[PDB]
Amino acid sequence: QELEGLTDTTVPKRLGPKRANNIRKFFGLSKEDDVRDFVIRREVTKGEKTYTKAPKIQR
Amino acid sequence: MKVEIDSFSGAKIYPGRGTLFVRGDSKIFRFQNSKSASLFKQRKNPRRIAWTVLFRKHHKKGITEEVAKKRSRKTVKAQRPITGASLDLIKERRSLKPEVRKAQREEKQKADKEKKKAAKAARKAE
Amino acid sequence: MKLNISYPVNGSQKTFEIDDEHRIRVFFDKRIGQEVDGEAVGDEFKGYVFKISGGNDKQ
RNA sequence: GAAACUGCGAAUGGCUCAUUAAAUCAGUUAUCGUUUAUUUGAUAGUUCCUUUACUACAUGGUAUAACUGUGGUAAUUCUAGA
């Protein structure tokens, strides 16, 4: 039997990776698959305008 | 009724039985019998008395109770939402490993723009 | 008492207030790291097994 | 650009004169008897380990804070769990 408050509902990981090889293993791509495209971006609504702030890539 | 434990021997004390001693530091001890009380007065140590629970513990006698804690080997097996990743689209993009030629196709236009910008800067310098 | 129970797969967590002392007496004389099944303490937790991670006392 | 991590500093300064009568201290020597963050100036071609596939060198890996949320207690610059 499933618990309404824990099992039924599910919650997000608030962040994605910031490290390159972490992304490469997150998506299992390659040493060459140009990680700059596989980036997670977080759209916002400050007002009518929106933007996603693809964070950064260290390493 | 609470069933207490001997401060010295670790044995069990039922009510109306044994004694209770109170030391100058306001501490309490409970004795099942005058035996334990007398050895305590003689300030022996239980770890060297062979009929005590502390002794049998520290020497690992009757120690078949605790066995071990096993080792876990299992993955998460759950792709959680990154909250800006759209886990459906995230699985779609993790499955987009092949067709990597689009990366080089975009890199070609980017390299072209790089030379174009170098030329534009070198010309604006004039 | 209270049980702060966490389902880390979804990433969720919830409090549960418990009575019926001879349900919760199962937990007595256990270590932080051992596991117990849940129907003994509540049939809502039937087939479930929880591990302990910590806790707080009065005061 | 708050917060948090990291690096620094917090051993300076300030206050008082209780102790202490070859002890402190003053002046004068020495370290061929030693440590020295910091500055300042100089200063590593040599480290692939059977070193002919053993290797990412256009560069390797695991945490974890802050944060999300659940809570504890009367309280504290208390805190756990995920």
Added chain:
RNA sequence: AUUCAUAAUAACUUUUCGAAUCGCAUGGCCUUGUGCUGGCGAUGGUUCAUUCAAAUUUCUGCCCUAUCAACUUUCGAUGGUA
């Protein structure tokens, strides 16, 4: 003034250091490749020196008391070897 500095051989080390760091300018060579080279810096780092110091330290020097003339040395007091 030295067993100094420094150098050389034999090895030893659980193995030290030898930049996986960052901001600007972005330039030159071409067999035009995201090819090869290339500046101004900040940080950090091994050792030597320096500076800031620090710790010990030489010599000489201190108030009243003899109604204190003997003190130290058991177990550190003076010295020696390790």
Added chain:
RNA sequence: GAAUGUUACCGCAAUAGUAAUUGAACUUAGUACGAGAGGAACAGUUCAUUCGGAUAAUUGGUUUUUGCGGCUGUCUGAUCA
């Protein structure tokens, strides 16, 4: 403990003796009483003092259980005992 016909059991009770005692606290009530100062009692409850009669679950003491163990000196060749 003889004798009462024996022996055994169950009993009556003449007589004699006699044992229970004292206090505090709470409440009654800071009421009654009294100007105020001050300040009760009966009933009820909880305990205690002195005395007595039993008992020994527990606590304590005692220990020739010479029960167990240890220690010294000596003797049994040594070890064990």
Added chain:
RNA sequence: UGUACAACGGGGUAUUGUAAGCAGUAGAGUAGCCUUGUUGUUACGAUCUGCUGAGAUUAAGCCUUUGUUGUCUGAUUUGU
């Protein structure tokens, strides 16, 4: 001549506190050996560890018993 009695035994409960013997790469360390050590082994060595909450004692005023072995007709006195 029997839910008979006793003596032994077994079990229970108690008391004490972990027997003797054997083993050990435990052991303060010390002699000696040679195949010289690459733990090299032999002798000494209070003590320690394991077999060991073992062993011993346990009714004389403890409990209990499907056990074994035995005992169970001697004298005296009494009458309404």
